[PDB]
DNA sequence: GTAGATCATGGAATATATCTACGCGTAGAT
């Protein structure tokens, strides 16, 4: 949340942030910049048994 | 003859980006 109120243009912390967020988010490195959001938006409903469709 | 014992005698608010001072590791010269 702090990320996305702060400047979108500064740059995130690779260790500290993401590398643990598409952890927690049962997400790789490679999913989370390489596919597109319509397969990201799927997978992470997958992971998280959600009902919802992008 | 007298004192003691005995007997009679009795109705109904938190995290984070930013600014700043300091030691300092390394760069530069020879």
Same mark, same amino acid.
């Given at each position: ?30 999913? $989370? +910049? #390489?596919?597109?959001?319509? &397969? /990201?938006?799927?997978? $992470? +409903? #997958?992971?998280?048994?959600? &009902? /919802?469709?992008?």
């Amino acid at each position: 949340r702090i990320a996305s109120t702060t400047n979108q243009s500064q740059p995130y912390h690779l260790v500290k942030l993401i590398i643990p967020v598409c952890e927690k988010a049962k997400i790789s490195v490679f999913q $989370l +910049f #390489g596919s597109d959001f319509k &397969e /990201l938006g799927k997978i $992470l +409903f #997958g992971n998280f048994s959600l &009902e /919802l469709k992008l």
